[PDB]
């Protein structure tokens, strides 16, 4: 097969080669096997040392015999300085960073030991390969000697995290009006990690932008379904909402652990448009969520939405000419497929309002007094194209001499700009 002869016989080169093939996701050999499997990896910086042996430094040289005394048997250490003890440098380093394939070639090496460490990577991997010793050549039992060595690193990324909002159903209970809140629920898988790291740091992190939302306060943060504890799984720092785990919890999870944090946030505004969107951020530069462990971080996946829009009620007499005073007014949520009651059902209304001097309804317990913020839908499945919610709009109290006008179903879509505009007009005998 190919093959080749010993450093010292006749036919043997004079140098040799390093190629790598960074992917993410085969103890060794030293050969290329062209069947990758997927996924490479450009971006990784890798510094190659050249050994020698200490007065001078002078470099190990495997065609003579007895610097193969010096090839160490186990793995390499983890850092320059404990190499440092062993052998000598005998350059600064050469550092060079892989290709769209995932792949750079160290060329024209001389038959010596080299030293390699990945010390760089893109800020998605959290954990990049060992350090590892290289020797030109490399004893192989196929090709006798291989001067052209091939390693396959490993790397390993962090997920990106997902994010849902809770449904419409339950957004019932939890609140309708401009100035209640929404949950949502950030799942983020947890990133495997390369033999011998322990977890250092874990962060999610979700910027708000403060038009639109204000942290309220986090519900849950479970892990594989068990949820959180206090003090052990730090879950502060409001501004610029951050969650900076404690070491208990990082030497307890494992790759595969789904980790799910839920917090909620008050709506404040009804936007231009009316699309709260909460989307991935990179870091905590700009408004989005994302994560970071051991330092490295991914912006998140999935986008959620929360619609709302507006209404205001112009109070008037039977043709509106006249702008009437005092005319109380009540929405309710009870719609079904276009259709209200004929009254008011004597549940608890969502929003109730009066009309002022100019017969504009300014409303009770949200802000502002006019319009009136209602909530439309949620979704976690991408945007909507055209959102709507039905509700009802009764008039409670008639001005003085005056007959009450009928109930009026009301459509509302996303945005201060599509605000509906209702003229409620009351009979006078």
């Avoid at 190629?19 to 060794?28: E, L, P, R």
């Avoid at 939890?174 to 962060?203: C, F, H, M, R």
């Avoid at 205001?312 to 719609?335: C, I, Q, R, S």
């Avoid at 006019?370 to 909507?384: H, K």
Wanted: glycine letters at 10%; a negative charge; charged letters at 20%.
């Amino acid at each position: 097969q190919a093959t080749a002869v010993g450093p010292d016989q006749p036919g043997a080169p004079t140098h040799g080669s390093l190629t790598v093939h960074k992917y993410v996701g085969n103890a060794g050999t030293g050969e290329e096997i062209s069947v990758p499997g997927g996924q490479p990896l450009e971006g990784a910086e890798f510094t190659i040392w050249r050994l020698g042996t200490n007065d001078s430094c002078e470099p190990i040289d495997l065609a003579n015999t007895n610097d193969w005394a010096q090839v160490p048997t186990g793995a390499a250490p983890r850092e320059l300085s404990a190499v440092q003890n062993d052998f000598c440098l005998v350059d600064g380093g050469t550092a060079r960073t892989t290709n769209s394939a995932g792949e750079y070639t160290f060329g024209n090496l001389d038959l010596g030991l080299y030293y390699v460490q990945e010390t760089d990577a893109p800020a998605n991997i959290v954990s990049r390969t060992a350090p590892f010793y290289v020797s030109i050549p490399l004893p192989h039992a196929q090709q006798n000697w291989l001067y052209d060595v091939h390693v396959y690193p490993k790397n390993q990324e962090v997920d990106a995290p997902t994010k849902t909002i809770n449904s419409d159903s339950d957004q019932a209970g939890k609140g309708l009006t401009v100035g209640s809140v929404v949950e949502w629920t950030i799942s983020q898988t947890v990133p495997a990690l390369n033999d011998g790291e322990q977890y250092t740091s874990a962060t999610i992190w979700d910027v708000l932008n403060p038009a639109e939302l204000e942290y309220a306060g986090t519900t849950s943060v479970s892990l594989n379904g068990t949820p959180l504890v206090e003090g052990t799984d730090y879950t502060i720092d409001a501004g610029v909402v951050s969650w900076s785990l404690t070491e208990k919890k990082l030497a307890e999870i494992k790759a595969g652990d789904t980790i799910e944090v839920v917090f909620t946030t008050t709506v404040l505004a009804v936007t231009e448009t009316g699309d709260i969107d909460n989307p991935g951020s990179e870091g905590p530069d700009k408004p989005g969520y994302g994560s970071e462990f051991n330092g490295g971080t991914t912006p998140g996946g999935t986008t959620p939405h929360t619609y709302w829009g507006q209404l205001t009620v112009n109070k008037g007499d039977t043709g509106m000419v006249n702008k009437l005073a005092g005319a109380e007014f009540a929405v309710f949520n009870n719609a079904e497929n276009g259709v209200c009651a004929p009254e008011a059902p004597e549940t608890d209304a969502i929003a109730t309002g009066v009309s002022d001097a100019e017969g504009v309804v300014r409303w009770n317990d949200v802000t502002p007094d006019n319009p009136l913020g209602l909530w439309i839908a949620n979704s976690s499945d991408g945007e909507i194209a055209n959102p709507n919610k039905d509700y009802c709009l009764y008039e409670t109290k008639a001005p003085s001499g005056y007959v009450a006008g009928p109930v009026q179903k009301v459509n509302i879509t996303p945005g201060t700009t599509a605000k509906l505009v209702v003229d409620f007009e009351n009979t006078k005998k």
